[PDB]
DNA sequence: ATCTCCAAATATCCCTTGCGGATCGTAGAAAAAGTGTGTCAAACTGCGCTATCAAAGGGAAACTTCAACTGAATTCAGTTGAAGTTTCCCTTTGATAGCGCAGTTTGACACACTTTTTCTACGATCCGCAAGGGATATTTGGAGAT
DNA sequence: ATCTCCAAATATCCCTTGCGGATCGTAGAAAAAGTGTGTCAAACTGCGCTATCAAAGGGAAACTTCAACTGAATTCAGTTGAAGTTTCCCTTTGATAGCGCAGTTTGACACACTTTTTCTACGATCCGCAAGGGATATTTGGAGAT
């Protein structure tokens, strides 16, 4: 098996990640396993978001993922919501939500 | 002739705008504002249109979140009506100044 | 031609709309001017930094990236415009 | 000129997870921002850890403790195990 | 002789806002730190400054939180801080969902 | 242990904060809030300790942990 | 020393060394540590100026952590710059909300 | 000897010097010095940190006094920024004079 | 309790487009392979400092007594912001043409880096003496009562 | 508004200890020199940004009417704060026990570097078509009215 991703059993690109670590002045030297570990983490996190956005697309009778689906995904998920607590997804809008006191009585 | 009670259309406006994701501030007016402010910092600036559109996305998101906090401040004080003092309370606790 | 008073293009109807998205049911008539005040400060801060990024690059065109970088600095990372 | 992007990998991982589902261009731009962003946070923290400990080199160890510092509990558990598992497999070859 | 309810509390504010001494007793705080560390990792020691660091950080944090809490109280035309005040402060801070 | 953070002590902190009147329920809340604050910072501090292959939590470890939570502390090795 | 050539108290060599060891970039230009040393000096000058006065105002000849806290929080810009920093043993600015005071 | 008791390194002397420059008859407690040392380190990192990014952002290999200047403009509020830029520019003007 | 009606939701048609799946021809980057070299894991060592111990008093925390004053509940009316209508401003949309300037290219080189010898700034360590601490007294600034 | 009464502010004096200056020794900065490549100035260019015009109509502004919200006013049960008494444990002081942090030396090896071989991923372009998204019509759920 030629490519380092293929070796590591990954879709995400180990060689690109190695290069981006070297050319980003994080340290003088980058160990062999670091971009393997890092490509794996990145692949994993994108699988989690795609999964959860994927479902959001289906609940809204939709076949193609748009930013609203990512936003619904992220903010309906306690952990992704925390991880992207200081982030704004362009064209995501907000969660449907109305405080109780404002409901008609 | 027919009339909805006060608050009914307001609630339905909330549902409508909570479902959608389109920018709520008019596009050219917002662009003029950005250019006016830029100009006061440096003259002869040009803007990529996506640069303006980014600012709008940022601004609408900030303002929308600030109204959520403002509302919580209004409700904290047994009101249903947002008031300047609600925004000011929100911004103070957020650590925003000026 | 001179740019003046453009904060007024941020209309009452448009502020009402943002407040709805934010779940606000009733709005005091004093909210519109407070909001303008606040939006202006918000945009001064971000634009000041974006323009600095532009100047550093010796450019005359503010890019999406200058804004994306300015926002990241203010702890307000934006997704959808590069970076 | 060439504009690098994670688009192809995100498509792949998307086919794995939801095989009959597409992604809009803007949605991808967001995914791309997300991957670059998390990358930055992790490499960043990893950089510090090496400095704090007088080290010249970033290893999968710094990535690992960087991951534990940055990700909320469960997301950190799985990422850590996906990470370790890939390095384990990676050393197993050559 | 009786000072009215509030007169001493006012005096106390003046006293504590004028000093910079720590206000939690040292040992009880130290015990709490080790208990909590114990739940993350067993068989651990602490530099004495490390504990100190945590106390400084912790009190500054709480004092500032009390400032914010007090404002929410006053926002509700009240003078007495209640859990709902802390909860609101912490939420607007973005410390809580 | 958590009750070592006593009612009079909490009052004292509340006073530095400008607080004149305290509901009786505040003391239990503060303890809860303080637990979560210490948990988070110590969680991070200990991660640094472990990474350094030490058994001793340093001031630096704490300072770094405090910097990560966006709570930079001066006076201990910044 | 480069500091003397630049009329600075702060070490231009050390700042230079520290910029090479911090992995900020592949190379460091010659002017950069001067400029940085300068800015660092100006800012510490600035604090000490205001801290000193707070020591004076408190009838003291030695600056303590509390004077640094007073200097910083009574100064709008320094307060902004250290918005997310806590000065150990600094306490708070004496501040009591109006409505809490008796009529 | 032979076993040397490490070696810490701080700004304490240069701070002490600047303290003399502006408050000749005023001193500083060791704890307060620790605070100033932190402050210098903190600012240093925030500045060099931006400058590093500016260099990356612009596909450049060197941190120049140009990145320090704009890093300072991004980091420091109104009046501090303006003064810091004067002091910095001036030192470079002066340092390049001296040969 | 029952009917009226309005606007959001459902349905039909037509059609534009932006997406996934191609196939393509191809710069640029990853991998492969050889080699030079410094980082850091290991193993052994010293001793700084963390834990701990034992005891004894002094002050803090806890508990108790009391009632002042604060939050919570209720009531009501003037104020005010929501809903709906009308007029028409100015945003949006779409195509146009001109050019300011962002981004790519190419040689000459200044300027950073690397290595080695020389010189010295600044860390470690030391302790006299005064700024500050701590104790007791006298002045002052205000609260609570009459 | 005036007269008794605490507690904090101020004054005074004697002890305590960390400021801050001084001594001494080295690691790190400066000086001098040879090498090369990132940076810079200058030439050329076409993307896309500003600028305009012009027609269409969606949305803003200004208005009237009035439902209902805010907040003013009033009451009071009870939760707090202030002061007293009681019970408990934090802090301080003198070490001795030895963990594990941090210093020192080293050589195997892992990663940097650079060159040649291999192929991944990007930019350009066309296609089937389900997915939308807009223009036009209808049915539907429920708010408000009789
Ligand atoms: Mn202007
Ligand atoms: Mn002076
Ligand atoms: Mn098409
Ligand atoms: Mn396509
Ligand atoms: Mn009650
Ligand atoms: Mn004295
Ligand atoms: Mn004293
Ligand atoms: Mn007198
Ligand atoms: Mn008086
Ligand atoms: Mn000293
Ligand atoms: Mn209309
Ligand atoms: Mn041992
Ligand atoms: Mn019906």
PDB file of N, CA and C in Angstrom, chain A residues 85-86, chain B residues 65-77 85-96, chain C residues 76, chain E residues 65 68-69 71-73 75 84-97, chain G residues 84:
ATOM      1  N   UNK A  85     -19.038  26.604  20.300  1.00  0.00           N
ATOM      2  CA  UNK A  85     -19.726  27.591  21.092  1.00  0.00           C
ATOM      3  C   UNK A  85     -19.459  29.023  20.659  1.00  0.00           C
ATOM      4  N   UNK A  86     -18.295  29.273  20.066  1.00  0.00           N
ATOM      5  CA  UNK A  86     -17.914  30.614  19.697  1.00  0.00           C
ATOM      6  C   UNK A  86     -17.831  30.752  18.190  1.00  0.00           C
TER       7      UNK A  86
ATOM      8  N   UNK B  65     -28.282  36.980  18.499  1.00  0.00           N
ATOM      9  CA  UNK B  65     -27.948  36.401  19.824  1.00  0.00           C
ATOM     10  C   UNK B  65     -28.149  37.430  20.923  1.00  0.00           C
ATOM     11  N   UNK B  66     -27.848  38.692  20.641  1.00  0.00           N
ATOM     12  CA  UNK B  66     -27.998  39.698  21.670  1.00  0.00           C
ATOM     13  C   UNK B  66     -29.475  39.879  22.038  1.00  0.00           C
ATOM     14  N   UNK B  67     -30.389  39.748  21.074  1.00  0.00           N
ATOM     15  CA  UNK B  67     -31.815  39.792  21.416  1.00  0.00           C
ATOM     16  C   UNK B  67     -32.289  38.602  22.251  1.00  0.00           C
ATOM     17  N   UNK B  68     -31.637  37.452  22.106  1.00  0.00           N
ATOM     18  CA  UNK B  68     -31.985  36.310  22.943  1.00  0.00           C
ATOM     19  C   UNK B  68     -31.662  36.619  24.384  1.00  0.00           C
ATOM     20  N   UNK B  69     -30.466  37.175  24.602  1.00  0.00           N
ATOM     21  CA  UNK B  69     -30.024  37.529  25.943  1.00  0.00           C
ATOM     22  C   UNK B  69     -30.856  38.672  26.527  1.00  0.00           C
ATOM     23  N   UNK B  70     -31.161  39.666  25.693  1.00  0.00           N
ATOM     24  CA  UNK B  70     -32.004  40.804  26.068  1.00  0.00           C
ATOM     25  C   UNK B  70     -33.365  40.325  26.548  1.00  0.00           C
ATOM     26  N   UNK B  71     -33.953  39.382  25.824  1.00  0.00           N
ATOM     27  CA  UNK B  71     -35.244  38.802  26.200  1.00  0.00           C
ATOM     28  C   UNK B  71     -35.168  38.121  27.554  1.00  0.00           C
ATOM     29  N   UNK B  72     -34.079  37.400  27.791  1.00  0.00           N
ATOM     30  CA  UNK B  72     -33.934  36.718  29.056  1.00  0.00           C
ATOM     31  C   UNK B  72     -33.854  37.732  30.173  1.00  0.00           C
ATOM     32  N   UNK B  73     -33.209  38.864  29.890  1.00  0.00           N
ATOM     33  CA  UNK B  73     -33.172  39.968  30.838  1.00  0.00           C
ATOM     34  C   UNK B  73     -34.561  40.584  31.024  1.00  0.00           C
ATOM     35  N   UNK B  74     -35.330  40.736  29.954  1.00  0.00           N
ATOM     36  CA  UNK B  74     -36.682  41.279  30.117  1.00  0.00           C
ATOM     37  C   UNK B  74     -37.552  40.345  30.983  1.00  0.00           C
ATOM     38  N   UNK B  75     -37.489  39.048  30.688  1.00  0.00           N
ATOM     39  CA  UNK B  75     -38.278  38.045  31.391  1.00  0.00           C
ATOM     40  C   UNK B  75     -37.825  37.980  32.853  1.00  0.00           C
ATOM     41  N   UNK B  76     -36.523  38.134  33.096  1.00  0.00           N
ATOM     42  CA  UNK B  76     -35.985  38.146  34.472  1.00  0.00           C
ATOM     43  C   UNK B  76     -36.680  39.178  35.329  1.00  0.00           C
ATOM     44  N   UNK B  77     -37.132  40.258  34.696  1.00  0.00           N
ATOM     45  CA  UNK B  77     -37.750  41.361  35.399  1.00  0.00           C
ATOM     46  C   UNK B  77     -39.258  41.359  35.210  1.00  0.00           C
ATOM     47  N   UNK B  85     -32.708  49.037  28.803  1.00  0.00           N
ATOM     48  CA  UNK B  85     -31.991  48.563  29.977  1.00  0.00           C
ATOM     49  C   UNK B  85     -31.749  47.050  29.955  1.00  0.00           C
ATOM     50  N   UNK B  86     -32.556  46.321  29.182  1.00  0.00           N
ATOM     51  CA  UNK B  86     -32.317  44.893  28.989  1.00  0.00           C
ATOM     52  C   UNK B  86     -31.045  44.652  28.167  1.00  0.00           C
ATOM     53  N   UNK B  87     -30.968  45.261  26.991  1.00  0.00           N
ATOM     54  CA  UNK B  87     -29.745  45.238  26.184  1.00  0.00           C
ATOM     55  C   UNK B  87     -28.501  45.636  26.987  1.00  0.00           C
ATOM     56  N   UNK B  88     -28.600  46.713  27.762  1.00  0.00           N
ATOM     57  CA  UNK B  88     -27.450  47.217  28.513  1.00  0.00           C
ATOM     58  C   UNK B  88     -27.046  46.197  29.550  1.00  0.00           C
ATOM     59  N   UNK B  89     -28.011  45.608  30.241  1.00  0.00           N
ATOM     60  CA  UNK B  89     -27.679  44.537  31.190  1.00  0.00           C
ATOM     61  C   UNK B  89     -26.948  43.389  30.490  1.00  0.00           C
ATOM     62  N   UNK B  90     -27.510  42.903  29.380  1.00  0.00           N
ATOM     63  CA  UNK B  90     -26.904  41.848  28.563  1.00  0.00           C
ATOM     64  C   UNK B  90     -25.476  42.168  28.166  1.00  0.00           C
ATOM     65  N   UNK B  91     -25.251  43.373  27.658  1.00  0.00           N
ATOM     66  CA  UNK B  91     -23.926  43.709  27.181  1.00  0.00           C
ATOM     67  C   UNK B  91     -22.943  43.846  28.318  1.00  0.00           C
ATOM     68  N   UNK B  92     -23.428  44.272  29.474  1.00  0.00           N
ATOM     69  CA  UNK B  92     -22.557  44.430  30.637  1.00  0.00           C
ATOM     70  C   UNK B  92     -22.044  43.066  31.100  1.00  0.00           C
ATOM     71  N   UNK B  93     -22.954  42.115  31.272  1.00  0.00           N
ATOM     72  CA  UNK B  93     -22.594  40.767  31.721  1.00  0.00           C
ATOM     73  C   UNK B  93     -21.759  40.015  30.694  1.00  0.00           C
ATOM     74  N   UNK B  94     -22.066  40.188  29.413  1.00  0.00           N
ATOM     75  CA  UNK B  94     -21.213  39.667  28.347  1.00  0.00           C
ATOM     76  C   UNK B  94     -19.777  40.216  28.352  1.00  0.00           C
ATOM     77  N   UNK B  95     -19.534  41.326  29.051  1.00  0.00           N
ATOM     78  CA  UNK B  95     -18.204  41.930  29.082  1.00  0.00           C
ATOM     79  C   UNK B  95     -17.922  42.816  27.877  1.00  0.00           C
ATOM     80  N   UNK B  96     -18.962  43.140  27.115  1.00  0.00           N
ATOM     81  CA  UNK B  96     -18.858  44.099  26.018  1.00  0.00           C
ATOM     82  C   UNK B  96     -18.919  45.514  26.583  1.00  0.00           C
TER      83      UNK B  96
ATOM     84  N   UNK C  76     -15.046  35.660  17.389  1.00  0.00           N
ATOM     85  CA  UNK C  76     -16.323  35.466  16.712  1.00  0.00           C
ATOM     86  C   UNK C  76     -16.166  34.786  15.362  1.00  0.00           C
TER      87      UNK C  76
ATOM     88  N   UNK E  65     -18.421  37.020  39.672  1.00  0.00           N
ATOM     89  CA  UNK E  65     -19.746  36.435  39.472  1.00  0.00           C
ATOM     90  C   UNK E  65     -20.765  37.080  40.391  1.00  0.00           C
ATOM     91  N   UNK E  68     -21.904  40.410  38.855  1.00  0.00           N
ATOM     92  CA  UNK E  68     -22.917  40.146  37.824  1.00  0.00           C
ATOM     93  C   UNK E  68     -24.241  39.684  38.431  1.00  0.00           C
ATOM     94  N   UNK E  69     -24.176  38.791  39.412  1.00  0.00           N
ATOM     95  CA  UNK E  69     -25.391  38.351  40.078  1.00  0.00           C
ATOM     96  C   UNK E  69     -26.172  39.521  40.696  1.00  0.00           C
ATOM     97  N   UNK E  71     -26.187  42.651  39.881  1.00  0.00           N
ATOM     98  CA  UNK E  71     -26.810  43.457  38.837  1.00  0.00           C
ATOM     99  C   UNK E  71     -28.136  42.878  38.367  1.00  0.00           C
ATOM    100  N   UNK E  72     -28.186  41.569  38.171  1.00  0.00           N
ATOM    101  CA  UNK E  72     -29.437  40.925  37.777  1.00  0.00           C
ATOM    102  C   UNK E  72     -30.492  41.096  38.866  1.00  0.00           C
ATOM    103  N   UNK E  73     -30.105  40.856  40.115  1.00  0.00           N
ATOM    104  CA  UNK E  73     -30.992  41.171  41.235  1.00  0.00           C
ATOM    105  C   UNK E  73     -31.572  42.586  41.090  1.00  0.00           C
ATOM    106  N   UNK E  75     -31.620  44.603  38.500  1.00  0.00           N
ATOM    107  CA  UNK E  75     -32.465  44.605  37.305  1.00  0.00           C
ATOM    108  C   UNK E  75     -33.909  44.201  37.613  1.00  0.00           C
ATOM    109  N   UNK E  84     -31.787  32.355  40.987  1.00  0.00           N
ATOM    110  CA  UNK E  84     -32.185  32.774  39.625  1.00  0.00           C
ATOM    111  C   UNK E  84     -31.261  33.861  39.049  1.00  0.00           C
ATOM    112  N   UNK E  85     -30.742  34.718  39.925  1.00  0.00           N
ATOM    113  CA  UNK E  85     -29.791  35.749  39.529  1.00  0.00           C
ATOM    114  C   UNK E  85     -28.467  35.153  39.086  1.00  0.00           C
ATOM    115  N   UNK E  86     -27.893  34.268  39.893  1.00  0.00           N
ATOM    116  CA  UNK E  86     -26.641  33.604  39.495  1.00  0.00           C
ATOM    117  C   UNK E  86     -26.829  32.877  38.155  1.00  0.00           C
ATOM    118  N   UNK E  87     -27.922  32.115  38.063  1.00  0.00           N
ATOM    119  CA  UNK E  87     -28.236  31.297  36.900  1.00  0.00           C
ATOM    120  C   UNK E  87     -28.317  32.132  35.627  1.00  0.00           C
ATOM    121  N   UNK E  88     -28.922  33.321  35.734  1.00  0.00           N
ATOM    122  CA  UNK E  88     -29.012  34.240  34.618  1.00  0.00           C
ATOM    123  C   UNK E  88     -27.662  34.826  34.259  1.00  0.00           C
ATOM    124  N   UNK E  89     -26.882  35.177  35.272  1.00  0.00           N
ATOM    125  CA  UNK E  89     -25.571  35.724  35.031  1.00  0.00           C
ATOM    126  C   UNK E  89     -24.727  34.699  34.300  1.00  0.00           C
ATOM    127  N   UNK E  90     -24.788  33.458  34.763  1.00  0.00           N
ATOM    128  CA  UNK E  90     -23.934  32.427  34.204  1.00  0.00           C
ATOM    129  C   UNK E  90     -24.372  32.114  32.789  1.00  0.00           C
ATOM    130  N   UNK E  91     -25.677  32.150  32.537  1.00  0.00           N
ATOM    131  CA  UNK E  91     -26.153  31.913  31.186  1.00  0.00           C
ATOM    132  C   UNK E  91     -25.725  33.024  30.233  1.00  0.00           C
ATOM    133  N   UNK E  92     -25.976  34.274  30.604  1.00  0.00           N
ATOM    134  CA  UNK E  92     -25.553  35.365  29.731  1.00  0.00           C
ATOM    135  C   UNK E  92     -24.036  35.374  29.546  1.00  0.00           C
ATOM    136  N   UNK E  93     -23.281  34.988  30.567  1.00  0.00           N
ATOM    137  CA  UNK E  93     -21.838  34.826  30.388  1.00  0.00           C
ATOM    138  C   UNK E  93     -21.495  33.787  29.312  1.00  0.00           C
ATOM    139  N   UNK E  94     -22.416  32.872  29.040  1.00  0.00           N
ATOM    140  CA  UNK E  94     -22.144  31.776  28.115  1.00  0.00           C
ATOM    141  C   UNK E  94     -21.361  30.656  28.780  1.00  0.00           C
ATOM    142  N   UNK E  95     -21.507  30.533  30.098  1.00  0.00           N
ATOM    143  CA  UNK E  95     -20.903  29.457  30.884  1.00  0.00           C
ATOM    144  C   UNK E  95     -21.844  28.256  30.933  1.00  0.00           C
ATOM    145  N   UNK E  96     -23.121  28.537  30.684  1.00  0.00           N
ATOM    146  CA  UNK E  96     -24.201  27.567  30.731  1.00  0.00           C
ATOM    147  C   UNK E  96     -24.974  27.644  29.412  1.00  0.00           C
ATOM    148  N   UNK E  97     -25.471  26.487  28.963  1.00  0.00           N
ATOM    149  CA  UNK E  97     -26.379  26.414  27.809  1.00  0.00           C
ATOM    150  C   UNK E  97     -27.674  27.227  28.035  1.00  0.00           C
TER     151      UNK E  97
ATOM    152  N   UNK G  84      -9.284  40.082  30.585  1.00  0.00           N
ATOM    153  CA  UNK G  84      -9.412  38.653  30.870  1.00  0.00           C
ATOM    154  C   UNK G  84      -8.257  38.114  31.718  1.00  0.00           C
TER     155      UNK G  84
END
